[PDB]
Amino acid sequence: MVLYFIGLGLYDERDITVKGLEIAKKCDYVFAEFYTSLMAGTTLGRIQKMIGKEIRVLSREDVELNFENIVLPLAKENDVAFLTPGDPLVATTHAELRIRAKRAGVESYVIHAPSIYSAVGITGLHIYKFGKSATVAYPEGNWFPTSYYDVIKENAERGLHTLLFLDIKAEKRMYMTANEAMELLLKVEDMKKGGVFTDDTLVVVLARAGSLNPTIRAGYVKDLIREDFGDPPHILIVPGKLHIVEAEYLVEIAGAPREILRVNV
Amino acid sequence: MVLYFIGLGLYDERDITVKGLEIAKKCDYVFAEFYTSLMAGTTLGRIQKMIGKEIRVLSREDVELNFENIVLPLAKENDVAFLTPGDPLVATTHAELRIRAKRAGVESYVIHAPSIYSAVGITGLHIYKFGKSATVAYPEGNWFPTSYYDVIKENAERGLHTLLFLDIKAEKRMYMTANEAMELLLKVEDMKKGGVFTDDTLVVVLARAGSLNPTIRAGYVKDLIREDFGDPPHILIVPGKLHIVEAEYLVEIAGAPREILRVNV
Ligand SMILES: Nc1ncnc2c1ncn2[C@@H]1O[C@H](CSCC[C@H](N)C(=O)O)[C@@H](O)[C@H]1O
Numbered sequence: 465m466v467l468y469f470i471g472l473g474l475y476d477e478r479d480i481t482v483k484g485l486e487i488a489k490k491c492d493y494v495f496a497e498f499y500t501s502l503m504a505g506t507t508l509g510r511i512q513k514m515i516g517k518e519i520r521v522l523s524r525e526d527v528e529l530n531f532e533n534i535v536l537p538l539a540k541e542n543d544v545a546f547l548t549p550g551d552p553l554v555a556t557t558h559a560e561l562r563i564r565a566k567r568a569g570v571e572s573y574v575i576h577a578p579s580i581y582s583a584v585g586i587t588g589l590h591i592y593k594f595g596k597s598a599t600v601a602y603p604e605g606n607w608f609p610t611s612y613y614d615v616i617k618e619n620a621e622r623g624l625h626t627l628l629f630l631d632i633k634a635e636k637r638m639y640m641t642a643n644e645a646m647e648l649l650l651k652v653e654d655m656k657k658g659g660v661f662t663d664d665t666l667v668v669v670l671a672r673a674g675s676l677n678p679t680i681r682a683g684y685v686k687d688l689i690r691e692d693f694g695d696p697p698h699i700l701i702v703p704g705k706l707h708i709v710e711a712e713y714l715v716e717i718a719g720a721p722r723e724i725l726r727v728n729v
Numbered sequence: 730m731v732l733y734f735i736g737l738g739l740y741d742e743r744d745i746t747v748k749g750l751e752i753a754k755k756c757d758y759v760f761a762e763f764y765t766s767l768m769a770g771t772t773l774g775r776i777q778k779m780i781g782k783e784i785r786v787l788s789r790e791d792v793e794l795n796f797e798n799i800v801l802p803l804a805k806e807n808d809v810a811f812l813t814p815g816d817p818l819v820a821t822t823h824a825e826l827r828i829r830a831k832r833a834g835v836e837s838y839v840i841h842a843p844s845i846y847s848a849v850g851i852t853g854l855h856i857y858k859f860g861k862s863a864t865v866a867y868p869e870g871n872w873f874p875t876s877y878y879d880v881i882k883e884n885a886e887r888g889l890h891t892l893l894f895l896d897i898k899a900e901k902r903m904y905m906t907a908n909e910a911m912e913l914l915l916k917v918e919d920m921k922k923g924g925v926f927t928d929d930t931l932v933v934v935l936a937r938a939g940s941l942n943p944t945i946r947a948g949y950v951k952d953l954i955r956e957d958f959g960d961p962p963h964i965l966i967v968p969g970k971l972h973i974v975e976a977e978y979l980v981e982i983a984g985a986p987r988e989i990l991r992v993n994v
Contacts, residue, residue: 471843473746473748473841474841476748477747478746478747478748478751479746479747479748479841480746480747481738481743481744481745481746481747481842481843482742482743482744482745482746482747482750482779483738483741483743483744485747486743550847551843551847551848551850552850552851553850553851553853554847554850554856556855556856556857558850559850559851559853559855559974559975559978560853560974560977560978562853562978562982563977563978563981563982566981566982573941573942574851576738576739576744576843576847576848576851576938576939577746577843578736578746578816578841578842578843578844578847579843579844579846579847579850581844581846581847581856582815582816582819582841582843582844582846582847583816583841585816585817585818585819585824586818586824586839586841588818588824588827591818591819591820591846591862592820592861592862592863592864592894593861593862594861594862595860595861595889596857596858596859596860596887596889597856597857597859598857618887622861622883624860624861673841674841676838676840709822709825712825712828713824713825713827713828716827716828716831716832717827717828717831
């Protein structure tokens with residue numbers, strides 16, 4: 465009679481919380497989706513071994529179109545767990561799944577776990593200073609989307625940081641790299657010329673947040689666009705004007721050039 | 730000789746990630762602070778019992794003024810852990826402690842945990858639509874803080890949601906409720922008269938996130954300002970322009986008045 469939304473965390477199978485692991489172990493059925501994101505630091509096998517339960521993977525369609533035909537029926541007479549990378553209900557469409565549960569007379573509880581939204585604090589940037597968030601998407605055929613550019617503009621002009629998720633084709637495990645994101649933004653800057661993203665723009669790259677050895681780099685596009693940040697996933701951030709303390713952290717921890725202490729503060 | 734910043738999570742001892750627990754168990758010395766937030770679901774005991782070590786709790790003073798005198802010295806020849814509520818680097822100034830660690834020649838690692846910052850997802854409001862965040866601070870003597878009122882105005886003008894962290898004075902066992910925050914806001918609205926926060930403003934209250942039964946309520950200030958949301962911690966959210974599915978979740982899951990289902994686009 466109960467459905468548990470459980471977050472798996474940031475990077476590997478140990479990123480789940482003690483609460484989520486113990487509850488998952490007690491569940492009769494366990495589902496998981498890896499289309500909204502991927503636990504790049506682990507495997508389904510390791511997650512399964514860690515929980516000691518068979519895990520049925522669901523596709524985007526399984527969830528969005530048939531959640532009530534696949535997951536909810538079993539929840540009416542058993543304890544069911546639905547695992548997702550990061551923190552549950554962060555992905556835009558997941559919150560409404562709880563409405564579906566209610567409509568089916570199924571009670572649901574949420575078990576939180578680390579999310580990149582909060583994990584980016586490791587970059588040293590003050591969390592309250594983040595503005596609207598966006599996703600950098602690959603252009604396709606005749607479609608060249610650019611809203612993520614306007615988002616950066618709207619945030620920066622108010623002294624706010626912009627968290628940029630990079631395009632992912634999880635089914636094919638194809639990651640957009642920070643380098644590609646920068647190249648794309650420079651291209652968008654070249655058509656719109658709003659003085660938002662240039663070679664002089666300061667940016668921060670966060671790779672493999674959650675692992676014990678993440679890659680935290682800060683600097684100007686002209687020096688980072690060709691730098692190697694390692695394996696995905698990559699997260700890009702275009703900071704607004706920095707507080708001296710933020711800049712000192714980027715310099716001491718993220719290897720940013722001393723120049724930011726006078727140019728971006 | 731390493732220092733670990735480990736988050737304990739939102740509500741109780743089980744909100745710590747498995748990664749954090751396994752590392753905490755193998756540390757020689759364990760420190761912690763409980764002034765940056767309130768974990769109303771646990772005690773130090775369960776944490777110590779869970780970790781198997783004795784934990785020395787530090788005051789804001791011990792940390793902000795003597796961290797390099799109390800903690801760092803030990804990390805020079807031992808593996809030390811510093812525990813904090815939620816995620817250690819979210820809405821705290823703990824990130825600066827990593828700089829001190831560096832300057833003292835001590836390597837530090839960050840182990841994330843579920844944070845109130847990403848838990849807002851359980852309110853049904855799209856997390857990417859959150860703009861700048863702010864804190865409703867206790868007025869002290871003649872000093873009456875108000876900047877948080879401007880943040881709401883700025884976000885609302887852009888149709889973005891506003892996350893309002895609530896003040897806390899751990900040494901005085903004072904934890905600001907969503908009610909107290911609403912009163913302070915009406916007072917600020919009374920003197921600024923910007924039509925930003927009134928009896929007709931729609932707000933959302935999230936109390937004790939992380940617990941299995943958090944209080945999630947949405948409605949007009951006039952109706953919620955006198956409502957009992959249970960024990961702290963509490964956060965207050967002032968939504969911006971609502972998407973249809975956000976409104977439906979608020980109504981179906983947070984008990985908001987059906988009339989908010991009607992969105993004026
Ligand atoms: N479980 C919870 N429920 C509601 N509000 C919470 C909360 N945990 C923290 N807060 C809010 O945030 C304030 C502490 S700010 C420190 C936040 C912490 N590092 C984190 O990652 O969550 C509290 O005064 C309260 O307003």
